[PDB]
Amino acid sequence: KRKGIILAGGSGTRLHPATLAISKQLLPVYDKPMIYYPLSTLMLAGIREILIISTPQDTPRFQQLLGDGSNWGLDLQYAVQPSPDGLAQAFLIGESFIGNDLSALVLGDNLYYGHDFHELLGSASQRQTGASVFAYHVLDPERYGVVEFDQGGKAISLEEKPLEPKSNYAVTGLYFYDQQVVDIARDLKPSPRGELEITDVNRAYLERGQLSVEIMGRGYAWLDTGTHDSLLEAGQFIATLENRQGLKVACPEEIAYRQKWIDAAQLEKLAAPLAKNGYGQYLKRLLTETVY
Amino acid sequence: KRKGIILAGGSGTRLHPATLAISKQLLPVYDKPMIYYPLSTLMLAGIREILIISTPQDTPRFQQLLGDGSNWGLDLQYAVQPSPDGLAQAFLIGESFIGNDLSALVLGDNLYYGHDFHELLGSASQRQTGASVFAYHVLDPERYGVVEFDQGGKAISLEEKPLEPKSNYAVTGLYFYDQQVVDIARDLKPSPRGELEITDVNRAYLERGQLSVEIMGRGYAWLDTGTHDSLLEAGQFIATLENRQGLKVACPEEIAYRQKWIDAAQLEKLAAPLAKNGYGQYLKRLLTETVY
Amino acid sequence: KRKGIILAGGSGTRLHPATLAISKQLLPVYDKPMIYYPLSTLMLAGIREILIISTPQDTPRFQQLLGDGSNWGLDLQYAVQPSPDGLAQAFLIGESFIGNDLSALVLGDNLYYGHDFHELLGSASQRQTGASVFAYHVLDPERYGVVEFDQGGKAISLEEKPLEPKSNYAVTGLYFYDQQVVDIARDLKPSPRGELEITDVNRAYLERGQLSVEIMGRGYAWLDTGTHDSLLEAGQFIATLENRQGLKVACPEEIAYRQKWIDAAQLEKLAAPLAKNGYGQYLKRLLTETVY
Amino acid sequence: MKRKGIILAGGSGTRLHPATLAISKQLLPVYDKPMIYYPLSTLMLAGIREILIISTPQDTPRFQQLLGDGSNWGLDLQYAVQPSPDGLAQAFLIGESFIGNDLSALVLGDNLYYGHDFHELLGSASQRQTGASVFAYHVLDPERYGVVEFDQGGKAISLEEKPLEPKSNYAVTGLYFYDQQVVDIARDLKPSPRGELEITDVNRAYLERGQLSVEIMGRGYAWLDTGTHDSLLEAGQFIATLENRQGLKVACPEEIAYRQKWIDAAQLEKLAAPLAKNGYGQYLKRLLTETVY
Ligand SMILES: Cc1cn([C@H]2C[C@H](O)[C@@H](COP(=O)(O)O)O2)c(=O)[nH]c1=O
Ligand SMILES: Cc1cn([C@H]2C[C@H](O)[C@@H](COP(=O)(O)O)O2)c(=O)[nH]c1=O
Ligand SMILES: Cc1cn([C@H]2C[C@H](O)[C@@H](COP(=O)(O)O)O2)c(=O)[nH]c1=O
Ligand SMILES: Cc1cn([C@H]2C[C@H](O)[C@@H](COP(=O)(O)O)O2)c(=O)[nH]c1=O
Ligand SMILES: Cc1cn([C@H]2C[C@H](O)[C@@H](COP(=O)(O)O)O2)c(=O)[nH]c1=O
Ligand SMILES: Cc1cn([C@H]2C[C@H](O)[C@@H](COP(=O)(O)O)O2)c(=O)[nH]c1=O
Ligand SMILES: Cc1cn([C@H]2C[C@H](O)[C@@H](COP(=O)(O)O)O2)c(=O)[nH]c1=O
Ligand SMILES: Cc1cn([C@H]2C[C@H](O)[C@@H](COP(=O)(O)O)O2)c(=O)[nH]c1=O
Secondary structure, eight states, rough: OOEEEEOOOOOOOOTTTTTHHGGGGOOOBBBBTHHHHHHHHHHHHTTTEEEEETTTHHHHHHHHHHTTTTTTTTTEEEEEOOOOOOOOGGGHHHHHHTTTTOOOOOTTTTTEOTTTHHHHHHHHHOOOEEEEEEEEESSSGGGGGEEEEEETSSSEEEEEOOSSSSSSSSOSSSEEEEEEEHHHHHHHHTTTTTTTOOHHHHHHHHHTTTTEEEEEEEEEEEEEOOOOOOHHHHHHHHHHHHHHTTOOOSSSHHHHHTTTTOOHHHHHHHHGGTTTTTHHHHHHTTOOOOOO | OOOEEEEOOOOOGGGGTTTTTTOOOGGGEETTTHHHHHHHHHTTTTOOOOEEEEEEHHHHHHHHHHHHHHGOOOOOOEEEEOOOGGGHHHHHHHHHHHTEEEEEEEEEEEEEEEETHHHHHHHTTOOOOOOEEEEEEEEGGGEEEEEEOTTSSSSSEESSSSSOOSSSEEEEEEEOOOHHHHHHHHHHOOTSSSSSHHHHHHHHHTTOOOOEEEEETTEEEEOOOOOOOHHHHHHHHHHHHHHHOOOOOOHHHHHHHHHTTOOOOHHHHHHHGGGTTTHHHHHHHHHTOOOO | EEEEEEEOOOOOOTTTHHHHSSOGGGGTTTTTTHHHHHHHHHHHOOOOOEEEEEOOOHHHHHHHOOOOOOOOGOEHHHHHHSSSOOOGGHHTTTTTTTSEEEEEEHHHHEEOOOOOOOHHHHHTTTSSSEEEEEEOOOOOOGGGEEEEETTOOOEEEEEEEESSSSSSSOOSSSSEEEETTHHHHHHHHOOOSOOHHHHHHHHHHHHHHOOEEEEEESSSSEEEOSSSSHHHHHHHHHHHHHHTOOOOSHHHHHHHHHTSSHHHHHHHHHGGGTTHHHHHHHHTTTTOOOOO | OEEHHHHHHEOOOOOGGTHHHHHHHGHHHHHHHHEEHHHHHHHHHHHHOEEEEEOOOTTTHHHHHHTTTTGGTOOOOEEEOOOOOOTTTTHHHTTTTHHHHSEOOOOOTTTTEOOOOOHHHHHHHHHSSSSSEEEEOOSGGGGGEEEEEEOOOSSSEEEEEEESSOOSSEEEOOOOETTTTTTHHEEEEEEESSSOOHHHHHHHHHHHHTOOOEEEETTTSSSOOOOSSSHHHOOOOHHHHHHHHHHSSOOHHHOOOOOOOOSHHHHHHHHHHTTTTTTHHHHHHHHHTOOOO
């Protein structure tokens, strides 16, 4: 069994005053809440039991939004991160939730999209030992954890926000772990930046030869809503795809149904109060149209 | 002396699920909350005393974001509209706030921008008798109150969301009134749509020969940010202007300073907590740069 | 070996006056000419010998832009389509070019993108019998050839621009054919719309049980620059991906180098004249950077 | 009084290659119509009917194919070649015969202006009969343009061309109005350090004589430059947003011609006919019966 975690807290200050009223992850991307996107990523990976970690103030907001998850065939739980003191804190806050299971962590403002994503997730998901992360070529690797490869394509180093990046491959905000992750996180000390760093957790696996680094090719989109510009671009990206296709991206209701976590009747009931708009009309359409 | 009202409620049904555990007029338009835009419009009209009317759920959210306005040299008050039963309800909810003063109403999701806008507003503000509204050419006039002109350019009729519009001129969501408006609203009955209609208020002034309809030229932008698509377009519009100019659109801090409602010391103190980002850095710059 | 055709002609009357000056397929999509995109698609399918068909006025302009292709390891040839009388005319105009070989046709204004695209292409291109086309879920199937599937997923009918589509699956503007296509096209007569239709070619194959319809999943982007709005959307889509990734979409120089059709020395020479710009700088970077 | 117009639509295309290998930047569409319609429309709105379009030797025939002699729009369009992009002031040398003994105006072919009361801002400048007039606009990146510095009283005191350390954030836009002194000023210029015959140097000549009028173009106007891939996209989106919202089109020369009475209703109807199967033609037709304020 693999349990999921969505880390959806974080500083806030960079995007104020936009984020003074609404935290990033509660800011919607085009037609649905930002959190739907990383949630749908965990769902597509086959994960149904998910811990949502947020700020003290947002945690109840997330509860109002998503509830216990039973509507979507999920088991959703909530915990608080008092201060954004590092991605790795997710494993300390989520220690009891994880128990003795495997796990996966996704960042609440990360938006993934592309063909054969289910396979990419599936292969990481099937690894019962070690950790798996994904490498994506970016313009600005200095903003991320950076993974360096040797001439043979083997991952050989990790550095967090390096002033002098060794490659243009960023480690994306999606991570799969075996049962070791909690104890690794328990042993970490704050970095210079003052954070309990996921890069340090991933490096612990790398130095034991237990880190799988999979390329996420250029045909995928991996976007982050970290800036005003990047939220706008992400919105435009989703809107172009949706309006071209007549399909919606990262609808949890759709994914639940396709995965047999909810049935047609359940789906019909979810669509009713959204009936007056495109999103409800869309869910109803799913009951009678085959989509490959 | 004119008091202002921002009517920022409305059914959110259309925009769900994007706006579920948050407020729709708190969504960013690019880089700042949507409500900053209409607020800035009233401020540019020389209005300091403003009543913000929203839903039971969202009114507290506005208060938390904007406070009493004193930081910006404003007097902000708040009131609740229990149910979205008409734009004209603003004048009933707002009756005691208005007192014996002139007034102006702007809708929370209306974004205006253009050259000489302060003159356009100044002109309506300086009419102490009757009402003033603005007509703007649109592609889909059936969505709005529509104003028909005679061959001489005189306004001759108003219809609310007509099936067969008599022109392509929509009445925008910005309205200036003398002391007759509360009494006119007091006497209204709900329409066939089942709403207490601002068009019926504007028609009451027109039937007495006391409605001024001013053309808002095609050089102005009048955007309505109340749909997912139109929110994205508005965001891009503001981003293009801001990044081209190195100026920000609709910063209340700037407008308050320019109007001498707050002094330099005050502006400096507002910028401090936003210092880490572009917005705080911008406010600081206004202290030592002349902008015409 | 399979030969390719890019049909890059067509009535421009729609996009006038924007295309009064230029053929639609010479307009840039963001940072490079539209024709680079379908050219790159053929290259990615392993096709090196390509006939570009355009109008009398433009064909020489395409020759000016692309030359004989030798610089990119290609064999580019040219032919004129006197009048835009149907997509199937490509096979009559290109009869001598195709000779006794397998072939592929791509429309000059079609932009495809997504993960594992080279696999989707290679599988169709490496078939040696029948015809292969791709079905993509769209909002507006009435604008395209539409494929209807039975309950088992088997394609059962094709209709060109039906007013009441039987599905939401459009046939995309990318077609792969065995040696039967020319004789099929020769027997066609103009449709009700006045055109020699590729849909009729594809039906001929379907009737013989020799049409392979492969799904192009929602993870792929299939865009059409046929309208002002859609060309703008496609530009933003490419811009977002490029700026995120620090990679460029559909650079023929890159693809030729990667396929080993040109070497490093040749790539370096192609970059030099573009060195003062981002595109040339990019081609240079590819010489010392490994991209997975 | 008549003013003659010049659109300088030449330039090194190297930057935008390969997008502009096929087409010159100034023929690329901004959303729905060719880039050059925009600065052409600016001149038209200023009351200028007689215009010289300057471009490279390769592009000159392309502009001539698109626009012709302008008679269909009530204009008198002429063409000339700039052999090499050796300075904006070259426009006055190349255009000397064309200008003759008249007032003149120069607009750059990739400059897009839009906003309320723009006709008034233009008419004020164009109706002056002395000196030069230019416009100052606040930008984020003044180092890309000519930059004007003001004193504490708002009077222009200096001009610098593409300064590494701008003295202000006010760029001089690519729209210039001149009296009959300009040709002789340009004739006396020598190339700058950038190796160009600079319009900034022409403008400084006027400033030194106290004959340069620098008018602020306020923040409510949009002044966009389509000279990069990103900027052309943003400009397209800007136009598309306004057009789709309004049901009106920006910088349609047929509309402006008709509104200025340079062509009549029958003429407009004929222009609409060949574009009728699209929205641009349908739009021209609509203008014959709808009053637009
Ligand atoms: C550092 C940190 C980030 N975050 C969130 C914000 C985004 O959803 C995500 C990315 O954060 P970042 O802005 O530091 O790159 O992780 C936390 O939730 N907690 C933390 O301690
Ligand atoms: C190799 C290569 C692929 N492509 C396109 C083909 C696809 O749409 C995508 C390949 O993505 P992938 O590596 O994730 O399968 O990139 C380029 O545009 N240029 C290239 O050089
Ligand atoms: C009808 C109504 C609208 N509104 C807000 C909703 C939008 O933000 C805007 C548009 O209203 P309308 O298009 O339904 O006339 O007005 C209220 O705040 N209260 C109301 O009673
Ligand atoms: C009259 C006219 C104006 N314009 C432009 C000029 C300004 O940018 C704008 C005029 O706006 P205004 O009517 O609000 O002053 O519209 C056109 O693009 N076409 C026209 O036919
Ligand atoms: C009908 C037709 C289209 N075309 C071109 C124009 C495009 O690249 C594409 C389809 O254009 P369309 O928007 O007119 O259907 O193929 C031709 O080259 N020849 C033709 O006979
Ligand atoms: C099945 C499904 C996939 N997706 C996303 C996941 C990947 O980003 C993408 C998969 O596309 P594919 O079918 O071409 O592999 O679509 C949804 O957004 N909703 C869904 O219901
Ligand atoms: C210098 C120069 C520029 N131009 C064009 C190029 C641009 O589109 C614009 C701005 O040029 P600039 O950025 O080099 O001052 O003017 C010419 O047509 N001829 C010239 O001699
Ligand atoms: C003074 C000021 C105006 N504006 C807006 C009001 C109008 O839409 C526009 C005025 O432009 P203008 O100076 O060209 O008349 O700018 C702000 O957004 N912030 C400000 O501080």
